[PDB]
Amino acid sequence: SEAITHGTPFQKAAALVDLAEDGIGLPVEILDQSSFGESARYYFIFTRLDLIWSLNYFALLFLNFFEQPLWCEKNPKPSCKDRDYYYLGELPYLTNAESIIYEVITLAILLVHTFFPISYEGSRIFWTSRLNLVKVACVVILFVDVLVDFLYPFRIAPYVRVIIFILSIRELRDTLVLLSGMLGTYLNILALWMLFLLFASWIAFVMFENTQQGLTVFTSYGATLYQMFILFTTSNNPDVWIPAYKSSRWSSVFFVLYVLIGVYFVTNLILAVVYDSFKEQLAKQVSGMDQMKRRMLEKAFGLIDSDKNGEIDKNQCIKLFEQLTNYRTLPKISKEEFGLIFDELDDTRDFKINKDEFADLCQAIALRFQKEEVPSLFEHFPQIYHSPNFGYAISFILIINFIAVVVETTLNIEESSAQKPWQVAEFVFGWIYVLEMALKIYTYGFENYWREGANRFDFLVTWVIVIGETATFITPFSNGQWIRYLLLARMLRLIRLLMNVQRYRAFIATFITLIPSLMPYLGTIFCVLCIYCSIGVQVFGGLVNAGNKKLFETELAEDDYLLFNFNDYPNGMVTLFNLLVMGNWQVWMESYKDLTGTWWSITYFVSFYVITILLLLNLVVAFVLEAFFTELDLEEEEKCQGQDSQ
Amino acid sequence: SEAITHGTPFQKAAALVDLAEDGIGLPVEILDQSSFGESARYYFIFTRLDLIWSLNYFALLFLNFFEQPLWCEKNPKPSCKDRDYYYLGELPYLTNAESIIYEVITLAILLVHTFFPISYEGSRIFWTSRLNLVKVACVVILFVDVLVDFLYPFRIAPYVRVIIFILSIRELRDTLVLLSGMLGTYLNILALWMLFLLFASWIAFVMFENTQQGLTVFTSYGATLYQMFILFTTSNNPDVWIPAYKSSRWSSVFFVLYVLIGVYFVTNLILAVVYDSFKEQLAKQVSGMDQMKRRMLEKAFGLIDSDKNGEIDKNQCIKLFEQLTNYRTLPKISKEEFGLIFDELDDTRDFKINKDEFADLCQAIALRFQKEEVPSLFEHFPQIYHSPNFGYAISFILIINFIAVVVETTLNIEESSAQKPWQVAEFVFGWIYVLEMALKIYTYGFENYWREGANRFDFLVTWVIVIGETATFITPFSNGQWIRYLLLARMLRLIRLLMNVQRYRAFIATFITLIPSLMPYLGTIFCVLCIYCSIGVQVFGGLVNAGNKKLFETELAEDDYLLFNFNDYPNGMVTLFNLLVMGNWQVWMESYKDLTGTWWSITYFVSFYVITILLLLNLVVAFVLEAFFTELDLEEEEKCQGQDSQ
Numbered sequence A, B: 001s002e003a004i005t006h007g008t009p010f011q012k013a014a015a016l017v018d019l020a021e022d023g024i025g026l027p028v029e030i031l032d033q034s035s036f037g038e039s040a041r042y043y044f045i046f047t048r049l050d051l052i053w054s055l056n057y058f059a060l061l062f063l064n065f066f067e068q069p070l071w072c073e074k075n076p077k078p079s080c081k082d083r084d085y086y087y088l089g090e091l092p093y094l095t096n097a098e099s100i101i102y103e104v105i106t107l108a109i110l111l112v113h114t115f116f117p118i119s120y121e122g123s124r125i126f127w128t129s130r131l132n133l134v135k136v137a138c139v140v141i142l143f144v145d146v147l148v149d150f151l152y153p154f155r156i157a158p159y160v161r162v163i164i165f166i167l168s169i170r171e172l173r174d175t176l177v178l179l180s181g182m183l184g185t186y187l188n189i190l191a192l193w194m195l196f197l198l199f200a201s202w203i204a205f206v207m208f209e210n211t212q213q214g215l216t217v218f219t220s221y222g223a224t225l226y227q228m229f230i231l232f233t234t235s236n237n238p239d240v241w242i243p244a245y246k247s248s249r250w251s252s253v254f255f256v257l258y259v260l261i262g263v264y265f266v267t268n269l270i271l272a273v274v275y276d277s278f279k280e281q282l283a284k285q286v287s288g289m290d291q292m293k294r295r296m297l298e299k300a301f302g303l304i305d306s307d308k309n310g311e312i313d314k315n316q317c318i319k320l321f322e323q324l325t326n327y328r329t330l331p332k333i334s335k336e337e338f339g340l341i342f343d344e345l346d347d348t349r350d351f352k353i354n355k356d357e358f359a360d361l362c363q364a365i366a367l368r369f370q371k372e373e374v375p376s377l378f379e380h381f382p383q384i385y386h387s388p389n390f391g392y393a394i395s396f397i398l399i400i401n402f403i404a405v406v407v408e409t410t411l412n413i414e415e416s417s418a419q420k421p422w423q424v425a426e427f428v429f430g431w432i433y434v435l436e437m438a439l440k441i442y443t444y445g446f447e448n449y450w451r452e453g454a455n456r457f458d459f460l461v462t463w464v465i466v467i468g469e470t471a472t473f474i475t476p477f478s479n480g481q482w483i484r485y486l487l488l489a490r491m492l493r494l495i496r497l498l499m500n501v502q503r504y505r506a507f508i509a510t511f512i513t514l515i516p517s518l519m520p521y522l523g524t525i526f527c528v529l530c531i532y533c534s535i536g537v538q539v540f541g542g543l544v545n546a547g548n549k550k551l552f553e554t555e556l557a558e559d560d561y562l563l564f565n566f567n568d569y570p571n572g573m574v575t576l577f578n579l580l581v582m583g584n585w586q587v588w589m590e591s592y593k594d595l596t597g598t599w600w601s602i603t604y605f606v607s608f609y610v611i612t613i614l615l616l617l618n619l620v621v622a623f624v625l626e627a628f629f630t631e632l633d634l635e636e637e638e639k640c641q642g643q644d645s646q
């Protein structure tokens, strides 16, 4: 547990292992900080000062981002019957005086966050870096629209807030490289997609003109490209070609041939491209990540080789491993570390250490050990640190804790009003579970809240139990059953302890890693909806009124989806989700073609679909196939290389 | 172009290249024929006699298979108002006298086809190989049903006909190995799938008991596992959780979390397993194919090495290459073939040829050359054989022929009754197209009807044109309209020729390969429907009547799907197709739960789904990802490897 304020004493001995820390967890530092400048030079202090306020910044980034539900409609005041809810949302819309407060607080942190790299980049460099120049200008745009409501065309604030939220996060920008690096391949294949629509849209207009079909549905040619596009999605499958089938039965041979080519041949081949084009772009990000590693190791190799000859004595590099605080006794480990990499140079047995050799060294060590084990810095003035047989024992606990609920809920079909003997069993079970995590700080380590992936995900849920049980009878109702389903992620911990089964073993570790790995790649799509909603709120604001007469003819009134409606922002975010899932997405396309009365409404849903069935095929479906083959072959090699490494 | 009747002269010199032919196109021969027995022993004659009647057999296998639409309903005669059509099909159902004519002729070929391996396998061997023991017994079951004609429980004929059709074809059996070799992995993951239905079905029953939701939809717990299964398919997405959403808006955060786990995380991970389990089973079929190759080369290496020492002089193997009819200037490249394929042994420069070395020889030759070029052998007594500048030229030919069609159809929106100057342009264009294939027999070769993949697919449509134009004015109406509509495979010939474009190069080189590669793997699924139809015809025969009162309440009458009906066989095959595509598949599950009045109807559609979303994820979607990476890397390698392949 060495220091982190460590590139500021900055010895050749000392400042190495901070750089060696920077390879293992792999955080970047700026190329301005990578070239020169130290914590003695009062710039690298501000680098680690930035990472102190990181949780301050991400608290702001979602604070800015979640304003978009809470801000009002595009047209509250032009609209009549404004305060009523004619199928509007739930949220309170913030008043204009309240609107200012939540933004001025928001902007001032951005003005810190955007101009904090002045403290460790030069102003003639900071304004040159051409990534900030986007982000700086986005701040100015909010600074305008705050001033407009301070002074009190269509208020283009919320599009920018997304773009601020996309770029600021390191993960979403790293996602966003994989779009623009690959988007030349997707729009490429979008043509040959559109070709086998237009050709196959045409033949149905050719074949079915004089029959009942062209009389009924396929009136225009443009009626077909409209319809046959929906059948490319197959979310309207038999309703299209009933009167083609009802007239002649042999007309089915067309449509069942079309969808086969449509779904089963093309849409997979769209996925075949995008998953294949993913691999090249992912390789460019990985190699772009690994060039960061060697370029940071070049600063590390130059920090030691002060003779500047490119060869370092071994005792010069052995001695820093205790300062590395990696392993405890070091008599002959580095002699073993020669054969662990491919070849020994052995021109001198110890004296010659080449540039690429040490770059292989620090990269190798953290894989085998994971022994750095660094906790957070504590004050010793309190000193609060208190100084599968058990696995099969805790296999039994979450069994009987689970069946306690199903007994409680088969009491609820009996509807016991006398829960007095059953409330004896209620409060006791939450008191139990805090004891099975207790041996871990007795056996191995204290700060493993951030270590086990279960403690990454259950740590709220582990501690939320008895604090919910506390205000049960001391509050002397709706929040009472709020716990009564919350006491069920016990099975989710029972999942992982059942997930030691070797029969499920590859499928286990993917779905574990599937939550952290696909958090940016689903995070970007959540930002994409925040674009499409804020378009559609402004396009379709007060459109579905209370008494709109074009409404009740259409499909939203037939199937009674007279909710989601786009009539403000959080109503829109649900509505784009159904268009994401493709559950009956042609209702809205059929509805807003009538509620706007125009065919330029069809633009909004197709432009969703193309970018969606890029992004669903891009980052959902192509990752899982990459993520499984990561988790599969490790299990396939851990037995085989465990025969080697032992 | 030597003979094929060639292992019956059966020289050590001669009968080699017939075995060398058997490696190149790779047909199997039986292990009885592989062990011993020759065309002198007459058994090898019956082997090639079998492959003469191959097209006779596949003409029978679809003849037997297509009786199942043409055979009648399960209950014509118990049903009242039998001859009327109350949402029944189109086909004429075969009369019982005319039925047996189509069956006795069918069976007599099977009795040839099943007992033809008597002629080249011993009877104590033929009844031992346990493929036949299935297949012979299936013949007996049909032989029963012909006796049932003279008598005039539920007539289980048509299930067997599929099983006969599956096993007889070599491709579908090779598909069917990949099921049973992998089905232990799929049902393995089906349980862990079923768990994250049940648990996620459970919480929605837990959450929504006291609210409006459990009052309205989620009445039973079994009501939820019913509903939440449909939302795993998302073919009923907002209709489920409207009254959960209409009451509390926060209930959406459940459902949008469920489908993400449901579709985007699980269903890909089901596809991740099945595509990964595909690779191992496909490797077993490939290695099972390649063991056939070396074991056939062992008979070839033993045919030459008559000294039985395992080493063959090169002039013994040089001399047969002219009998192979492979290449013209032989002795200059046979020394280069030492250097091209692999490394030379060079203990003797030519004298020593090992067992595995010759196995490397004949394997590599057919790749580089393709110079065997075997035609269909003619009688010379008639002697009917008559003894990209052009590519950019025939690029232009279809274009002006294509725009002639769209001019003809924009005449039809004008509706010209005077087609007399326009019929000058009609008949002339079909006469043109037979001339662009004509240089191929002048430049390169005659029998390339089976060689170019375009001539594999266009050859019916290439020649159908002028014979459709012939009976236009000499018949002095509805049929010649469709021929006017048929004038469109020209752009389908443009599809192949245009993808010399490197921008689209890999994509349709897949799609070319995609039709023959996925012909068995879609063929099996077509057989799977012929199982599920013949179940559902017998289960649901006269159910959707004319005046059924339970019918008009349900969804098939609401959305007017009163076709797609199950009330005979070909209504079923359309109907299972919609359940295959997943276009509104919950209508039938909602309908036949009412029209049978029972909950055991739900079995039929779920058991469809699990086997289907095996087989769609199995053999559609896993192939295209395998097939693209076959087509992609060959384009990626040949540009670099052609500098080495030279």
Ligand SMILES: CCCCCCCCCCCCC[C@@H]1[C@@H](C(=O)O)[C@@]1(CCCCCCCCCCCC)CCC(=O)O
Pocket: A089, A090, A091, A522, A523, A525, A526, A529, A570, A573, A574, A577, B249, B250, B252, B253, B256
């Ligand atoms: C893939 C997405 C990962 C990111 C997770 C989303 C974080 C943002 C959370 C949104 C919370 C809004 C809840 C709204 C209810 C409330 O109680 O306030 C409410 C809005 C309905 C649900 C909103 C979620 C829609 C977007 C999620 C799905 C898209 C992501 C792909 C109604 C307001 C009320 O009356 O209380």
Ligand SMILES: CCCCCC[C@@]12[C@@H](CCCC)[C@@]1(CCCCCCCCCC(=O)O)[C@@H]2CCCCCCCC(=O)O
Pocket: A249, A250, A252, A253, A256, A257, A260, B069, B089, B090, B091, B522, B525, B526, B529, B570, B573, B574, B577
């Ligand atoms: C992949 C999967 C498959 C599915 C199947 C379905 C269908 C298709 C085929 C495609 C290719 C493979 C089919 C065929 C055809 C159709 C049609 C139907 C109708 C009937 C009508 C009759 C009269 O005429 O009336 C299948 C379905 C069925 C079959 C049938 C055949 C024949 C027909 C006619 O006849 O038309």
Ligand SMILES: CCCCCCCCCCCCCCCC(=O)O
Pocket: A198, A199, A202, A221, B406, B413
């Ligand atoms: C593969 C391309 C085939 C056809 C694609 C081009 C067709 C473009 C427009 C077709 C004509 C529309 C017919 C009605 C228009 C009108 O009468 O004004």
Ligand SMILES: CCCCCCCCCCCCCCCC(=O)O
Pocket: A194, A197, A220, A221, A222, A223, A224, A225, A226, A227, A229, A599, A602, A606
């Ligand atoms: C990418 C291919 C298609 C994308 C979107 C499909 C929209 C094409 C359908 C045409 C709209 C209706 C035709 C206009 C006829 C009219 O206005 O009278």
Ligand SMILES: CCCCCCCCCCCCCCCC(=O)O
Pocket: A220, A221, A222, A225
């Ligand atoms: C962004 C590019 C996509 C282009 C969108 C579709 C291109 C063609 C538009 C379809 C209109 C054809 C309708 C003509 C027939 C008619 O109006 O009567």
Ligand SMILES: CCCCCCCCCCCCCCCC(=O)O
Pocket: A159, A163, A531, A535, A538, A539
């Ligand atoms: C984050 C980049 C945004 C991408 C495109 C945003 C702006 C495109 C269209 C904006 C408003 C379009 C609506 C026009 C019709 C109307 O306002 O009534």
Ligand SMILES: CCCCCCCCCCCCCCCC(=O)O
Pocket: A222, A598, A599, A600, A602, A603, A606, A607, A610
């Ligand atoms: C990929 C971008 C999607 C392309 C959107 C297609 C737009 C076509 C809209 C209908 C076409 C007919 C235009 C006439 C407009 C009108 O009738 O008012």
Ligand SMILES: CCCCCCCCCCCCCCCC(=O)O
Pocket: A528, A531, A532, A535, A539, A596, A598, A600, A601, A603, A604, A607
């Ligand atoms: C994240 C980038 C997405 C931007 C692309 C979506 C914008 C395309 C169309 C938006 C609405 C256009 C149709 C509105 C017509 C109208 O004004 O009535």
Ligand SMILES: CCCCCCCCCCCCCCCC(=O)O
Pocket: A406, A413, B198, B199, B202, B221
């Ligand atoms: C992960 C599992 C959670 C629960 C799964 C087991 C539930 C099986 C049946 C639940 C009880 C059904 C309630 C009504 C039955 C009745 O009273 O007849």
Ligand SMILES: CCCCCCCCCCCCCCCC(=O)O
Pocket: B194, B197, B220, B221, B222, B223, B224, B225, B226, B227, B229, B599, B602, B606
């Ligand atoms: C593979 C998981 C589910 C598969 C099929 C889902 C069927 C479960 C739904 C239960 C049916 C209705 C409940 C019975 C109650 C009753 O008899 O009224």
Ligand SMILES: CCCCCCCCCCCCCCCC(=O)O
Pocket: B220, B221, B222, B225
């Ligand atoms: C082939 C195995 C699949 C098993 C099919 C589903 C297993 C459970 C069946 C659901 C019935 C539960 C309904 C109980 C509640 C009630 O009826 O009141």
Ligand SMILES: CCCCCCCCCCCCCCCC(=O)O
Pocket: B159, B163, B531, B535, B538, B539
């Ligand atoms: C090819 C193998 C067939 C697989 C299973 C076939 C037989 C299973 C069920 C057959 C009939 C089931 C219908 C029972 C109810 C009824 O006949 O009324």
Ligand SMILES: CCCCCCCCCCCCCCCC(=O)O
Pocket: B222, B598, B599, B600, B602, B603, B606, B607, B610
């Ligand atoms: C994988 C196989 C599919 C499993 C099929 C689930 C069958 C459940 C059917 C409903 C369960 C309730 C049984 C009561 C029958 C009845 O109400 O008549």
Ligand SMILES: CCCCCCCCCCCCCCCC(=O)O
Pocket: B528, B531, B532, B535, B539, B596, B598, B600, B601, B603, B604, B607
């Ligand atoms: C190719 C193999 C598929 C066989 C599996 C399908 C058979 C499962 C259920 C068939 C029908 C069962 C439900 C009928 C109930 C009834 O008799 O009313």
Ligand SMILES: [Ca+2]
Pocket: A304, A305, A306, A307, A308, A309, A310, A311, A312, A313
């Ligand atoms: Ca040195």
Ligand SMILES: [Ca+2]
Pocket: A338, A346, A348, A349, A350
């Ligand atoms: Ca050494």
